[PDB]
Amino acid sequence: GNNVVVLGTQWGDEGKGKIVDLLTERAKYVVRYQGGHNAGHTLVINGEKTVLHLIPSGILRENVTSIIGNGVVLSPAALMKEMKELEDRGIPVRERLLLSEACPLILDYHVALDNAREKARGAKAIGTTGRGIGPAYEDKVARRGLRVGDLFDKETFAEKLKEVMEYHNFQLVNYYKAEAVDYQKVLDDTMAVADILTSMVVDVSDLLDQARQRGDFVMFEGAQGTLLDIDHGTYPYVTSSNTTAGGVATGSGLGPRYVDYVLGILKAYSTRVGAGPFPTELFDETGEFLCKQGNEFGATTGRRRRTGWLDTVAVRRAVQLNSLSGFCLTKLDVLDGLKEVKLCVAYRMPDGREVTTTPLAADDWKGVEPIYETMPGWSESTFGVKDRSGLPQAALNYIKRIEELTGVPIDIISTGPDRTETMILRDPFDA
Amino acid sequence: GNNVVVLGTQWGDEGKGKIVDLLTERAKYVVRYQGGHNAGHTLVINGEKTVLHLIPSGILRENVTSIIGNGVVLSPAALMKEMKELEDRGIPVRERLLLSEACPLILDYHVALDNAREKARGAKAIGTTGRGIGPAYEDKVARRGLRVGDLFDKETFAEKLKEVMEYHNFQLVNYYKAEAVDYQKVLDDTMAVADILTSMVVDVSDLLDQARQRGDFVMFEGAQGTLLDIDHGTYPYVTSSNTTAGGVATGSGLGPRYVDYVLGILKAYSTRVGAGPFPTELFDETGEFLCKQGNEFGATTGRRRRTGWLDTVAVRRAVQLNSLSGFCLTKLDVLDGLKEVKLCVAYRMPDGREVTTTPLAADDWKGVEPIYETMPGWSESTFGVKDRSGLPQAALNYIKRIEELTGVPIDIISTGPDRTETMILRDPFDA
Numbered sequence: 001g002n003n004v005v006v007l008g009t010q011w012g013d014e015g016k017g018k019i020v021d022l023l024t025e026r027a028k029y030v031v032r033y034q035g036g037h038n039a040g041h042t043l044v045i046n047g048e049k050t051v052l053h054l055i056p057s058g059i060l061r062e063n064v065t066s067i068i069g070n071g072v073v074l075s076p077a078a079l080m081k082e083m084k085e086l087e088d089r090g091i092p093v094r095e096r097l098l099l100s101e102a103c104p105l106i107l108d109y110h111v112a113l114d115n116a117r118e119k120a121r122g123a124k125a126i127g128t129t130g131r132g133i134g135p136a137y138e139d140k141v142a143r144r145g146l147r148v149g150d151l152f153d154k155e156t157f158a159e160k161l162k163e164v165m166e167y168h169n170f171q172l173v174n175y176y177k178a179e180a181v182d183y184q185k186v187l188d189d190t191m192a193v194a195d196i197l198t199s200m201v202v203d204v205s206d207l208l209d210q211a212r213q214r215g216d217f218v219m220f221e222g223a224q225g226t227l228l229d230i231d232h233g234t235y236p237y238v239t240s241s242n243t244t245a246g247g248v249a250t251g252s253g254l255g256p257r258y259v260d261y262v263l264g265i266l267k268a269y270s271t272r273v274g275a276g277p278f279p280t281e282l283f284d285e286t287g288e289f290l291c292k293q294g295n296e297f298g299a300t301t302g303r304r305r306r307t308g309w310l311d312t313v314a315v316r317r318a319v320q321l322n323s324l325s326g327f328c329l330t331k332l333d334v335l336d337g338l339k340e341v342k343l344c345v346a347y348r349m350p351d352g353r354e355v356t357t358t359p360l361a362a363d364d365w366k367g368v369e370p371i372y373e374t375m376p377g378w379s380e381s382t383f384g385v386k387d388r389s390g391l392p393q394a395a396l397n398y399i400k401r402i403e404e405l406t407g408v409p410i411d412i413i414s415t416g417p418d419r420t421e422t423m424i425l426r427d428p429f430d431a
Numbered sequence: 432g433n434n435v436v437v438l439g440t441q442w443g444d445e446g447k448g449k450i451v452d453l454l455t456e457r458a459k460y461v462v463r464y465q466g467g468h469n470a471g472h473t474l475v476i477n478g479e480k481t482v483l484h485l486i487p488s489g490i491l492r493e494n495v496t497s498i499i500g501n502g503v504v505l506s507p508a509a510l511m512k513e514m515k516e517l518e519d520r521g522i523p524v525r526e527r528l529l530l531s532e533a534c535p536l537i538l539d540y541h542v543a544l545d546n547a548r549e550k551a552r553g554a555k556a557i558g559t560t561g562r563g564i565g566p567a568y569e570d571k572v573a574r575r576g577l578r579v580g581d582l583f584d585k586e587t588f589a590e591k592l593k594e595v596m597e598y599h600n601f602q603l604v605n606y607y608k609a610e611a612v613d614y615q616k617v618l619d620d621t622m623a624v625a626d627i628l629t630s631m632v633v634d635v636s637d638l639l640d641q642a643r644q645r646g647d648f649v650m651f652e653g654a655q656g657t658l659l660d661i662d663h664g665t666y667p668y669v670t671s672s673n674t675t676a677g678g679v680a681t682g683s684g685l686g687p688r689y690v691d692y693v694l695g696i697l698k699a700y701s702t703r704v705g706a707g708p709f710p711t712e713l714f715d716e717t718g719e720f721l722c723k724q725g726n727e728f729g730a731t732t733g734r735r736r737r738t739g740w741l742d743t744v745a746v747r748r749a750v751q752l753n754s755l756s757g758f759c760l761t762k763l764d765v766l767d768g769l770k771e772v773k774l775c776v777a778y779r780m781p782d783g784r785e786v787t788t789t790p791l792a793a794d795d796w797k798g799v800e801p802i803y804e805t806m807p808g809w810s811e812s813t814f815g816v817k818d819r820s821g822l823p824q825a826a827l828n829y830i831k832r833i834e835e836l837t838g839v840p841i842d843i844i845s846t847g848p849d850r851t852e853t854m855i856l857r858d859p860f861d862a
């Protein structure tokens with residue numbers, strides 16, 4: 001197809017970064033449609049290692065154009081840092097990037113509200129940890145926030161900031177007992193970068209329809225994982241935004257019906273961070289293995305990342321929330337030199353029932369125990385394999401059950417952290 | 432199709448009621464996907480005439496299940512009053528109605544916020560905000576609110592409530608100088624409707640996935656008109672949620688790829704309630720003519736609704752934001768008896784450029800001059816016309832021109848409020 005959606009089907013750490021850059025070679029336009037500065041996509045350019053969090057992945061491509069859409073909450077502060085980076089590293093970012101007028105803006109007071117929230121509410125529980133993504137979203141809904149649009153009219157921009165800034169300053173100092181935020185400084189700061197942003201502004205949903213009208217290849221990138229979707233996920237342990245394919249129409253302004261293909265990235269085993277339900281977690285040695293063999297540690301003060309078997313029951317939930325077209329299985333290599341592999345195919349509830357559908361985020365997940373289906377292992381090294389002819393019988397057998405169980409096939413198979421380590425059985429853009 | 436979506440392509444008040452009642456005779460399932468107790472739909476409940484604001488008119492039917500999808504904010508207080516209302520009338524509401532667990536709850540403190548917010552940020556001349564819909568959405572997105580699913584753990588609602596309420600009385604009394612909502616009252620009232628609300632909860636996403644797999648006729652319905660969309664509408668002047676079709680994946684739990692036909696209801700002309708750009712608004716006799724014959728009175732303390740000719744530039748945005756499948760033209764009969772008639776085909780920008788796309792809320796609406804096509808009208812009344820042939824050549828020219836300027840077929844025409852006064856040219860379901 002031409003409009004392809006890419007995203008992780010679990011809780012993150014699916015290993016999205018590789019496939020992305022991979023699909024970014026056949027796509028003309030690239031669009032971020034949800035969330036904020038927490039994309040987490042690492043790259044390398046000027047012989048130095050750089051990690052992007054805002055700029056889409058396609059900025060490297062010369063004849064590609066990357067767009068940040070209406071669904072992304074913006075932070076000039078974080079855009080100027082990433083640009084400055086690539087510009088220094090020699091990348092025409094200004095001639096390659098475009099943003100929506102409708103993008104909600106995160107300003108220092110928005111980080112302050114967050115910083116002051118967790119500390120207070122409870123510095124050990126999930127408040128929200130600094131970048132004010134939630135406050136930016138909340139101000140939006142309530143119809144008091146600001147957008148890139150506003151920057152066009154400076155006179156008006158100054159007055160509105162003061163109306164918003166006072167309501168927030170009031171609750172900061174008065175409620176939270178935190179130092180206030182100087183309106184003049186936020187003002188100085190944003191004006192200094194105004195004309196940059198304003199100059200990258202474009203009519204996105206028009207350009208997108210126009211792009212569809214002529215058959216250009218577009219790829220939509222979600223930044224976080226499906227099972228953390230503010231609504232549909234394992235609530236209350238969720239993230240600030242919607243993390244599913246359905247947020248694409250809302251996020252860019254394209255119709256529901258022009259979503260042609262939806263690629264769901266898929267790790268061969270599972271991992272989660274922070275508390276939250278995790279039915280197939282492993283407690284002792286295989287658990288250790290799946291971590292040691294897969295690089296499951298840190299990456300941002302990540303004390304440690306939990307691991308367990310592939311839960312088919314939740315993957316199925318993701319299949320339905322996204323109307324997934326096909327999969328992209330990652331890290332099958334970690335499974336090598338393993339006695340066997342289990343696939344979870346149903347749960348046992350605390351009342352004694354056996355159920356094939358994710359329990360409502362209102363029933364004890366801590367109670368559900370996984371009915372595992374065991375399968376023979378494989379000692380052969382899959383790492384690096386660049387065709388399926390070299391995949392063992394057992395490897396192909398594990399695939400089929402995941403396919404037979406989920407009711408969606410695997411079009412891309414990944415066999416290593418390197419580009420070359422991939423098997424494109426189909427490719428979203430020609431399907 | 433089979434998964435049908437029905438919604439307003441303009442600024443609301445397009446005349447959806449009649450169409451929805453009509454389709455619910457064909458639908459096995461009816462789904463609300465965005466909104467609150469706005470709905471507003473006069474049902475002549477077998478003798479007695481009643482105005483439903485939350486329950487779907489599809490509840491009056493012997494073989495249709497009605498679902499309040501998770502994108503709708505829920506008010507117990509409100510739904511109980513509608514239950515007994517219909518249960519008094521003899522309708523088994525309690526057994527054809529299913530609520531999703533993800534539905535945010537609207538409660539006392541959300542309305543009393545609304546009622547204070549209006550006082551201060553409003554003025555004497557009908558302050559119609561007091562509902563609590565904006566507020567609840569503000570709590571959801573900030574992972575700070577309660578849901579229906581929360582009711583499944585009585586001891587935990589008790590604590591999470593005191594917290595979200597602690598935060599709200601601080602605003603009510605210290606910022607707004609209004610009073611506080613009493614906690615034990617709100618805890619008490621809610622607990623007395625709990626076992627009822629949790630007795631109707633169901634796994635929505637699966638249910639729908641089942642009916643689709645199974646091929647049943649599922650209908651989805653939007654409450655507010657398209658250009659009021661929190662995102663792609665006239666910013667200041669937009670509601671609190673997402674009115675377009677994309678709100679379907681998100682408020683129900685059914686991915687984007689499974690919406691089949693997206694039917695947009697168009698009014699023979701446009702009207703507007705309140706502030707905001709209306710580039711074709713009429714200030715002369717024709718307006719009075721349109722308002723008068725259309726009965727565009729707000730059906731209560733209805734300050735006259737703004738009027739004007741139909742706007743193809745505005746209407747085209749709608750088509751683009753929802754990937755419209757076909758139109759349903761209403762109140763065409765209101766134009767009977769008009770020497771000639773116009774339609775807007777382009778907007779003239781101040782620097783002369785004539786264009787076919789609305790100003791991206793920024794380089795303003797206020798400055799736009801409209802460009803029309805004046806075509807002759809009709810005299811011969813078209814009320815009740817049941818066949819394509821019985822329409823005058825002037826009224827037919829008109830329809831075909833909307834079709835041309837937009838590129839979407841008018842598949843359904845309404846020629847009177849009763850149900851027999853309708854022309855089905857395509858039929859969304861068997862299309």
Ligand SMILES: Nc1nc2c(ncn2[C@@H]2O[C@H](COP(=O)(O)OP(=O)(O)CP(=O)(O)O)[C@@H](O)[C@H]2O)c(=O)[nH]1
Nearest residue numbers: 013014015016017018039040330331414415416417
């Ligand atoms: N061994 C192995 N490593 C892989 C494979 N595919 C990717 N990797 C590696 O695993 C990691 C995958 O995560 P990354 O590529 O950063 O994407 P992501 O983790 O989904 C993005 P974020 O975590 O910010 O949402 C990378 O460090 C990459 O080199 C694979 O097939 N096998």
Ligand SMILES: Nc1nc2c(ncn2[C@@H]2O[C@H](COP(=O)(O)OP(=O)(O)CP(=O)(O)O)[C@@H](O)[C@H]2O)c(=O)[nH]1
Nearest residue numbers: 443444445446447448449761762763845846847848
């Ligand atoms: N003369 C005439 N009257 C019509 C026609 N179609 C509907 N009506 C009248 O339209 C009015 C509006 O219908 P209704 O369905 O209640 O409102 P709505 O447009 O669905 C919803 P909202 O106001 O929330 O946007 C009704 O009061 C009905 O009496 C028509 O084709 N001709």
